[PDB]
Amino acid sequence: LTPKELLPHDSGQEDNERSNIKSGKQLKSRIRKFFASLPSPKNDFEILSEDEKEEDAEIAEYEKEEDNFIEPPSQDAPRVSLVAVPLAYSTLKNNPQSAIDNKYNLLVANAINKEPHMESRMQHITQGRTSMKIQFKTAMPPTEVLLESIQSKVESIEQLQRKLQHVQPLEQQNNEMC
Amino acid sequence: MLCAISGKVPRRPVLSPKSRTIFEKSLLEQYVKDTGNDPITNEPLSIEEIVEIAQQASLTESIPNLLTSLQNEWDAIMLENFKLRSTLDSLTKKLSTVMYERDAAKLVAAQLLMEKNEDSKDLPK
Amino acid sequence: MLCAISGKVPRRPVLSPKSRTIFEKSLLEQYVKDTGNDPITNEPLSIEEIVESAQQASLTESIPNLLTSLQNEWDAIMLENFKLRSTLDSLTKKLSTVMYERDAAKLVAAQLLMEKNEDSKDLPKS
Amino acid sequence: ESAQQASLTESIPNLLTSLQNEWDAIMLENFKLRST
Amino acid sequence: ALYTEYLKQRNNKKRRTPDFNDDDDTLFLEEYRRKYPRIDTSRYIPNESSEVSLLGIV
């Protein structure tokens, strides 16, 4: 028994296995793809599911870390969450049609709320005032960096365009005299 | 009748062979020059794969009004494009709030089954 | 601006009427005196077929180029809608399955809060 | 059976200011040409 | 008629005119300004990528 650079490869593989269990079992939504902290909105939404809404609001404030962070004693989850996902999948053509009909009703509800809008008006002009600050300063930088380079060659272009209107006017009186 | 990229009535339609879809020659070429793929089915397709496949002229009305008509339609299309983008970001945002509560509820089910397992031990004693 | 045979800047351009391509006169004349043909498409072409009014023109600048510009504006905006429409059919398809598994799991949560409280109601009375 | 036109740095104007000047210059020239 | 009168048909300069804290039709006007700025930044981004080179070849 003589190990050499094997316990270092085994400690690296054990550390690579432990990082794979921590990254997968951290959060389902945070790891996949894509909020402001608000304890007043969790207090206002108490009066909903009225038990699960407060469980999901405290879970959103804990994973994000007027904001206090308390419990990361929640997410060793990886074996208990696998049994919970397999038990819920067993309890869950007809189901595919009932999901497509409810998706069309939610799409019609999304098209009706947008149609009624087109308080909320003051936020859109302030987002435009942020855009008119950002884009037009980016426009004035891209214009003046261009106009230092293009207006020199615009004069190279436009004065050579003016040579064409005199070469055409000398061509017609010469063709008339020819 | 409709190109399934922009929805215009196609004036030089081309059909893709990898997926059954009649596109427009200009719009499908810009997609293929970006990435060599089919916009519907994401299958590997090229420009030479396309097979180049009703015309009714609009007669609007009985010219300065047609200037302001064009001004209104570009004004409407810019808003009919903008409203469909903020709707996309908010339905993805409201889908995200459902994904947190789906994973938070299956953690609350773990403590509730423990209370049932603790109770089943006590009922047997 | 270029001659298709040599690659230089032609000082006497002549355009052929069998394959439209701007050739230099002294180069293409030698090509025609070699064999009576057009060098690109190998179709028959003579020296009189190669050729070097009143309406004055102006340079192509930013009416016609303005109309073709607004084609580019809208054909690009049409692709911008497809990036949106294809992403909407992915998020709403994922929302239909997420709201379904939420509706299917909340019936189990409603039964576990019943069963774990009923088992607490049963055990404490005994 | 390529030409390049450099669009201006200040390219609203293509709808408003450029398009009015194209149909002004078309209108005034042909009328002056009928006068010619 | 336009050349004989010497008068030009007026274009819409309403997008320059828009103002904050106004009604629902003007809410359409300010969102129109946002779509025009995003298009203007996209049009300016193509010119920057091209460089003078494009003005040079013409």
UniProtKB/Swiss-Prot annotation, chain A:
Quaternary structure and interacting proteins, as annotated: Belongs to the NTC complex (or PRP19-associated complex), composed of at least CEF1, CLF1, ISY1, NTC20, SNT309, SYF1, SYF2, and PRP19.
Transmembrane region(s): none
Stretches the record annotates as Interaction with PRP19 and self-interaction: 109-127
Segments of this protein annotated with the region Disordered: 5-24
Residues of the full protein shown: 332 to 541 of 590
Subcellular localization(s) per the UniProt record: Cytoplasm; Nucleus
Record's function text: Involved in pre-mRNA splicing and cell cycle control. Required for the binding of the NTC complex (or PRP19-associated complex) components to the spliceosome to mediate conformational rearrangement or to stabilize the structure of the spliceosome after U4 snRNA dissociation, which leads to spliceosome maturation. Its absence leads to an arrest of the cell cycle, possibly due to the inefficient splicing of TUB1.
Name assigned to this protein: Pre-mRNA-splicing factor CEF1
Other observations noted: Present with 784 molecules/cell in log phase SD medium.
Family per similarity comment: Belongs to the CEF1 family.
Species of provenance: Saccharomyces cerevisiae (strain ATCC 204508 / S288c) (Baker's yeast)
Lineage: Eukaryota, Fungi, Dikarya, Ascomycota, Saccharomycotina
Bias-annotated ranges (Basic and acidic residues): 6-20
Swiss-Prot record, chain C:
Annotated localization: Nucleus
UniProt superkingdom: Eukaryota
Span list, region Interaction with CEF1: 63-120
Region (Required for self-association): 54-126
Domain U-box: 1-62
Function comment: Probable ubiquitin-protein ligase involved in pre-mRNA splicing. Acts as a central component of the NTC complex (or PRP19-associated complex) that associates to the spliceosome to mediate conformational rearrangement or to stabilize the structure of the spliceosome after U4 snRNA dissociation, which leads to spliceosome maturation. It is also probably involved in DNA repair.
Family: Belongs to the WD repeat PRP19 family.
Note: Present with 11700 molecules/cell in log phase SD medium. The tetramer is an elongated particle consisting of four globular WD40 domains held together by a central stalk.
Subunit details: Homotetramer. Component of the NTC complex (or PRP19-associated complex), composed of at least CEF1, CLF1, ISY1, NTC20, SNT309, SYF1, SYF2, and PRP19.
Protein name: Pre-mRNA-processing factor 19
Source organism of this protein record: Saccharomyces cerevisiae (strain ATCC 204508 / S288c) (Baker's yeast)
Residues of the full protein shown: 1 to 140 of 503
Swiss-Prot record, chain E:
Superkingdom, natural source: Eukaryota
GO cellular component, one term: Prp19 complex
Keywords: mRNA processing, mRNA splicing, Nucleus, Spliceosome
Example GO biological process: mRNA splicing, via spliceosome
Compartments reported by the entry: Nucleus
Subunit and partners: Belongs to the NTC complex (or PRP19-associated complex), composed of at least CEF1, CLF1, ISY1, NTC20, SNT309, SYF1, SYF2, and PRP19.
Further facts: Present with 721 molecules/cell in log phase SD medium.
Biological role: Involved in pre-mRNA splicing by stabilizing the NTC (or PRP19-associated complex). As a component of the NTC complex, associates to the spliceosome to mediate conformational rearrangement or to stabilize the structure of the spliceosome after U4 snRNA dissociation, which leads to spliceosome maturation.
Name listed for the protein in its UniProt record: Pre-mRNA-splicing factor SNT309
Lineage start: Eukaryota, Fungi, Dikarya, Ascomycota, Saccharomycotina
Gene encoding the protein: SNT309
Shown residues within the full chain: 60 to 117 of 175
